[PDB]
Symmetry: D2
Subunit: 150 residues, 4 copies
Amino acid sequence: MLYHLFVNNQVKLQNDFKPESVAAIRSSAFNSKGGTTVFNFLSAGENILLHISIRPGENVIVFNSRLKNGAWGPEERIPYAEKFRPPNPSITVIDHGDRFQIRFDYGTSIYYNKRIKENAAAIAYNAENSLFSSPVTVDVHGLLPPLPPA
Amino acid sequence: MLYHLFVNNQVKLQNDFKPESVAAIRSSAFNSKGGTTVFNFLSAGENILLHISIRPGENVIVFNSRLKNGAWGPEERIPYAEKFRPPNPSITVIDHGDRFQIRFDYGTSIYYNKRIKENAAAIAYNAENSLFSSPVTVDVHGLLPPLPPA
Amino acid sequence: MLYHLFVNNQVKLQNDFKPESVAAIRSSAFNSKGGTTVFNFLSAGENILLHISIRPGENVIVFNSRLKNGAWGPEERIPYAEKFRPPNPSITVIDHGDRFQIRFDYGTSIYYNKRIKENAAAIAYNAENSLFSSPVTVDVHGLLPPLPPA
Amino acid sequence: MLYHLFVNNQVKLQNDFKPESVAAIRSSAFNSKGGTTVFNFLSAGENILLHISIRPGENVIVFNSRLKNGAWGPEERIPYAEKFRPPNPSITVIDHGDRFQIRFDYGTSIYYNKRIKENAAAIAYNAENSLFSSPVTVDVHGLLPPLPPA
Ligand SMILES: CC(=O)N[C@@H]1[C@@H](O)[C@H](O[C@@H]2O[C@H](CO)[C@H](O)[C@H](O)[C@H]2O[C@@H]2O[C@@H](C)[C@@H](O)[C@@H](O)[C@@H]2O)[C@@H](CO)O[C@H]1O
Ligand SMILES: CC(=O)N[C@@H]1[C@@H](O)[C@H](O[C@@H]2O[C@H](CO)[C@H](O)[C@H](O)[C@H]2O[C@@H]2O[C@@H](C)[C@@H](O)[C@@H](O)[C@@H]2O)[C@@H](CO)O[C@H]1O
Ligand SMILES: CC(=O)N[C@@H]1[C@@H](O)[C@H](O[C@@H]2O[C@H](CO)[C@H](O)[C@H](O)[C@H]2O[C@@H]2O[C@@H](C)[C@@H](O)[C@@H](O)[C@@H]2O)[C@@H](CO)O[C@H]1O
Ligand SMILES: CC(=O)N[C@@H]1[C@@H](O)[C@H](O[C@@H]2O[C@H](CO)[C@H](O)[C@H](O)[C@H]2O[C@@H]2O[C@@H](C)[C@@H](O)[C@@H](O)[C@@H]2O)[C@@H](CO)O[C@H]1O
């Protein structure tokens, strides 16, 4: 299923993002002078199941979670540098049941153990000065699709 | 290369759409009550190399061409019905050198002999009440990419 | 539909190879010092709808057609000039209704106007010293599948 | 990278099968009355990093590991219960660093925690009466490739 997720907005998923689900987020642009950009996978109750804070100025990408009116837990970080590929950078998130796998353009995957046992009903996108385009293209799969030879 | 083509607007291609090029246009929605929707492949000089007029009310899809200040030539038509697949209908255009191949979700391809020997520098999207989303996602390939088993 | 086509053998297609059909042939190797290698798309009646003779020595690729017990028609040749990318070279054939499109790893697409109005029911592979592996992996589609962004 | 893995044989990988690596195994047939079929991911030192024993009779799939001249470790089994889609069944194995992900045509992904900290250098295929074709088509990726919208 294809969605167009606009900045400082979100998209309500047709079906819940759950185990086996794959979300391929792709930007039509890369604004090198952009600021902190965030993507949140939210449950129906608006709990932040997966928070991805891309911070170029801090050279880090922070992952976390928290209930709608709860507090962030410990942060999980990785260097920002050498992760995205202009002019069409991408973010791929896969739900492996007990944890999410996040993959950017380069480098190894990031694995984030789930902290809230719920499926995502929406994906939000927030940024004052986004690093990516608005909207960003999002393809959500119920399961990993057949793969091309390359 | 990924582009976000908004309705009643266009996208300037990074490189020209020419022989071997493949443009995959995908909508995030299908507005059954939408009207006539158009996609034009334009040259640098703004000549309409390939005009695709999707007319639900007339139950037809019209293909044509014309110079920037020229006249349409003869029309090439196909029934509108059973061509698109909601909620993510698509249009795939392939430049075969001497003609374009246009493929929708269902049915056989449409072949349109080129009438203007030029490459496209832009793709335009026009509609009063579009049948598709705004923007529509557009992936342009320099050549047919590797194919998945299905 | 996946088939394993062995050298000096053939594979019977579960479905007619006809307009919109795509055959993605892939080899697990490239035998540098290989000799003339042939791929034929045959009708159920064993007419050779599309003959592809890749000749390293003569440095040409000959395309032709012929009825079961008939003689070869006029040849349509092009220079061989390094069309394959080792170690996994590919040959993709697409049925466009009035003609076939043949794409290798390099060079431009080759177009061959159909000479016999029949669909292919089998693909044959012949060679004394094949340029490719035995068997070759063959994925046949009834229509062009959705494409990855790259 | 494409390989043709023959039954009761193996294929030496041009590159280490390691974190981020994906092995897409595809069969050109499904032998209904086939017997126990095995696929092993081996280290260059011939340690069995991941053993996959598909047993129709016992109706289970056993996953295990073992050093070259060592004994099998504790078994991790699941019911076989119709995991393959004829006539072209598939097995996809992904290296996630601390564990392997194995996906069949049906059922959920199977996760197997790594028991040996080595990368795979070869994939073996064993069976007296294989459930699948010989050889099986194997596409190995260094990283998950861009995905088609479907
Ligand atoms: C190393 C460390 O622990 N630094 C902490 C920052 O990462 C925290 O920032 C907040 O982090 C959460 C995720 O854990 C989320 O990304 C918040 O949006 C983020 O807060 C924003 O960004 C900060 C840099 C501040 O400008 C803040 O005002 C913003 O609202 C902060 C706050 O929890 O604590 C640091 O110790
Ligand atoms: C069967 C036939 O020939 N009908 C003709 C219409 O198809 C023409 O419409 C115009 O067609 C061109 C492509 O050839 C292009 O799609 C134009 O946008 C389209 O004109 C618009 O749509 C028409 C239905 C009218 O409402 C017109 O005012 C719009 O501007 C017309 C006009 O060339 O002629 C018919 O004969
Ligand atoms: C310059 C020229 O026209 N050369 C002709 C060859 O191309 C012909 O070869 C045959 O070509 C058909 C397709 O047209 C098919 O590829 C046959 O396998 C091929 O014949 C074989 O290869 C030849 C090189 C000879 O060794 C022949 O004995 C084999 O049977 C030939 C024959 O039609 O004529 C040439 O003039
Ligand atoms: C209930 C139980 O634990 N069953 C055990 C079998 O699963 C074992 O079979 C061997 O299992 C390993 C992986 O753990 C591998 O699949 C071996 O090929 C397999 O041994 C073969 O198949 C068996 C069914 C026997 O026919 C045996 O002779 C073969 O060599 C066996 C042996 O470890 O123990 C069972 O208890």
